[PDB]
């Protein structure tokens, strides 16, 4: 049951290389948990393009107190970390199955 | 009278009904009430306050975001 | 020799005074009616040319009024559109050559040959017709009316409400004066500024007038419909 | 003498410049709010008219006084 | 009041009050230092006893 | 000599520029908070009008003088 | 001695002050709101114009009174 | 000749101008702050009474001058 | 006694600061929206042209008087 | 001649425009900062008053002249 | 008399009030945008020039009057 | 002919309105910066006093001419 | 009534005139000296009564001075405290009854009852002493110093150093005038407010002026500390 | 009677008052603008200096008039 | 008459406002910028001191006129 | 004098109102300041 801090040692380096231009796209391979009997590998894009399959829910607008750029720059590193954290945690469950 | 949800990357902390929120906003602390106008904001290392019928619980927030609707 | 004049009549008094304001009012009426029938007689399911432009204009204003208010868009559409169409060509006629030059048949008394808005009689005429339309539909929609605005604090202080009466009485004057003030000044602008360098100087300020004259027509149209929406609420 | 004439001219102009910028900032204040919170139009716009018509009043007081100066 | 003698007399009176205030200000400085020393000594003494 | 008439015209006109700007900014100021916290309305509108009353005050003293010397 | 012509010159110039700056605010306010999102543009466009038209309403009072004093 | 009437007209109207917008900015300053932070009435309201008195000091100074020249 | 010359000078002067600061506000507000959302540029730029239209309209009204008084 | 009297009026009238809005700008800026950073409220209030205390100095400079003129 | 001397100075002087504040506001909004977004420089400056030009049009109108009255 | 008497008023009157609104701008700007970050306290305060000194110096010259016109 | 004068001479001159700045300011100095002995004599580890009030006032001023500047918090503390204490006592004494009703025992003599800063000489002397103190402390701290005041050419501007020098020179006169103006206006305003509606009208204004004097007194001390900060760097 | 002396006095007063605030506006926003992204400073500085130097060009012409009137 | 006296008084006060408010706004923009961006504060202060240097320059041009009026 | 009596009456009325409002907080502030000083001194004395 690892914590988000454990994956920060890799995620931060990946994002810093992405920001510096060393890496132009970023991917993950994780053991997707389909069922207790089937654990197929999965590929997911990490480049934070967008996640609107939820139809942007109500798509309500907000007043970005720190600003458009500041909110964007502070949410994208967190979003990929959450995606990595979920994928690693999903892999752990798939590993045990 | 607004549904508060404190969700963390590890677990959910609290999901009850709240009277008032004393959020530590980046530019300056703001109050959040039952029917506040839409908002989503970055937080900074600080000390958020939740008011329960006159009682204050320092849910100090190391940092994160807050979407108010 | 700018020869600016506020009100003119150009004789024409068989039994009663017929000012040259009516003369231009009729010729614009004839032109818009001639334009009206031309698109109407050649009615096609797929419009083109002259028919295309007429309907495109009307739907444009119709959408704007629907944005303002849609549940009286159709009822108020006749009055407001005529207000727009009539004055618009008047300003557009007011920019034709011969506004002040004409009159050489004794001072050079000039046939109006301009926007009728440059005379007050046009303005107050356009003012009250809107004002009664607002009040008539104000009583038609609100019923007895004066639920607010007539002291009787009902969430809004009674101190304000006497203020709106002096506002309702002044907007028809404001509506009358705005059409008069902007356009007649544009006339005096053209003549007086032509007094200095009448060649190659007036063109920028010219197109400024036609744009303003174009805007003055629509802003007047918007106000009457908007005031109708304000009165209804 | 044009002492009454200048009195009319100053009263209309000097009494309207106050509301002249006053009207601008009010609705401009409202249009910022409506862009931020579209759903609250009927409430804020209600306070908009009782603001603008309230402000134009002082201009109107100048006008009726000016008309009194002109003839009265 | 425009008078050099009045200004000089006021200046002398103000200067005299400054010297009197200087002694008064000197006394609060000693009191402030004593409070800081006593508080520091109490904390040091308490730590030594606990250890 | 219509100097009295001039004084009356100036007092009412010069009165309006003071509160007239003051009145406008308040409604713009109030509407922003309403777009922020619509439900402080029962409190902020109270604070809004009392401020307007102060703006009303500076207008009326000029108006009182405008009518005092207007009739003598 | 030509003082009436000065009054007319004063009325036109002075009356354009408040509306001149007020109109600058309103359109600046609207475009900022429109810049936030274009969906609400059409609705606030009318709210812009009705705010604008009230601004000229005070100015043209100085305009109209100028002709009433200059030619009457 | 009537200049004393004119002098009164200047003092009352013109002395209230600075405060006339000045009284606005104070309470218009508070409304955004209290709207953002509802629970800060303990000091913002008090300081807003601090500001209104200071800005109205110019207004009353205009008034007292008007009475002195008025009489 | 060139009193009318003062009137001509005054009319153009007060007619300038009225809109002369507004149009600065007009472009200042518009350009911010341009920077944030350049997609709506062509839509809002027309309105910026629409907004300035009333301003120089009020401005040249003084110029109308500035030349009318100078010559009859 | 009563020109001495209007001298007092301009002395108290003018010289109040600046600090009158000066009071407004100072505290309004401060109260905004108080809401943003309530913890440092005491420190900024000290700067808040010294900002004021300098401005009525400008205001009173009008008054002292207004009193000098009244008493010669 | 010398009143035409005074009118010349007032026309050039009081004519300069309008654009004087206006020009500063124009580029200040423009410089804010260019600092926020550098990519639109070719567009904002083009609009800033065609807008700022209208300010001095009012001024040069008065500036001409400063010569017509003098001569 | 007390033209010196009115010269006193406008001299202090004009010279106070500028810095009067001027120094208000510094304090509001300064206090706003502190709320963002009190770490820059030492630098800004020195710069804060530099700004007010320069603008008030202009008002000081309005004072000395007021004394100069008072005497000669 | 409502008479006020900026010049006071009192009476009984023993070889030198004794103005109002020697009959009410001396009492203020005596009262200030009295406070330095009526509460600092029976000193205790735990302050209480008069001792607590004096300690709290001194601590608040020291903390405010320390916040303004800590390197010379105690270096100029006696100078700042003396000015603040004298001004506060004078401002408070100016609100006492009989300020303008004294001297009747023949016009009444305002002397011995006006504020110490009411006279333009006492306020000028107080600021001048503070101005010399700031310059002397700046000279002591910065040695020769005054590099900006020397108008030496730098990379900022060639015209810089003159306005700052003028501002530094004008700082004493401005401080003296501000103290003189604030006291004079408050005394005049209360007297003028008594001319019309003498009963219970100037209730809030007189109390507000007392707080204004207290604010001004602290501001004068802060401004003197600000000059020290300006002289610091 | 000294009207030329008045004329030169008012010309510089109006000539500087206009852009005097304006020259502040450009650099007040400038220090803000170069604050966000210093890399455009290499380019925006050219646009600013032409921005200022084109402003007092209006102002200094008022001085030229003042010099023109001070000696005919 | 006393037109020499009023001219020099007008020259000092008038023309110190725009620069006076210009000085207030200019450092206010800087203090806001340096607080948010302390890293480049030293470089921008130069522009601030460049910016102010033009402000008094306009004002001092008023001061030099006063000496000319006093000395003829 | 009528003015002198009115001035004394206004001063007395102002003094009573100002003292009543201030002393409620001033005494509480003085009591809080005295208690804070006493508690710190007592704690330091007790520890030593």
TrEMBL record, chains C, M:
Membrane topology of this protein: Multi-pass membrane protein
Subcellular location: Cell membrane; Membrane
One Pfam family linked to the record: ATP-synt_A
Name of the featured protein: ATP synthase subunit a
Primary role: Key component of the proton channel; it plays a direct role in the translocation of protons across the membrane.
InterPro entries: ATP_syn_F0_a_bact/chloroplast, ATP_synth_F0_asu, ATP_synth_F0_asu_AS, F0_ATP_A_sf
GO molecular function: proton-transporting ATP synthase activity, rotational mechanism
GO cellular component terms, semicolon-separated: plasma membrane; proton-transporting ATP synthase complex
Organism: Chloroflexus aurantiacus (strain ATCC 29366 / DSM 635 / J-10-fl)
Stored PANTHER family: ATP SYNTHASE SUBUNIT A, CHLOROPLASTIC
Source organism superkingdom: Bacteria
Keywords assigned by UniProt, alphabetized: ATP synthesis, Cell membrane, CF(0), Hydrogen ion transport, Ion transport, Membrane, Transmembrane, Transmembrane helix, Transport
GO biological process: proton motive force-driven plasma membrane ATP synthesis
Membrane spanning stretches: 16-38, 72-93, 120-138, 179-201, 208-228
UniProt subunit comment: F-type ATPases have 2 components, CF(1) - the catalytic core - and CF(0) - the membrane proton channel. CF(1) has five subunits: alpha(3), beta(3), gamma(1), delta(1), epsilon(1). CF(0) has three main subunits: a(1), b(2) and c(9-12). The alpha and beta chains form an alternating ring which encloses part of the gamma chain. CF(1) is attached to CF(0) by a central stalk formed by the gamma and epsilon chains, while a peripheral stalk is formed by the delta and b chains.
Major localisation: membrane
Record family assignment: Belongs to the ATPase A chain family.
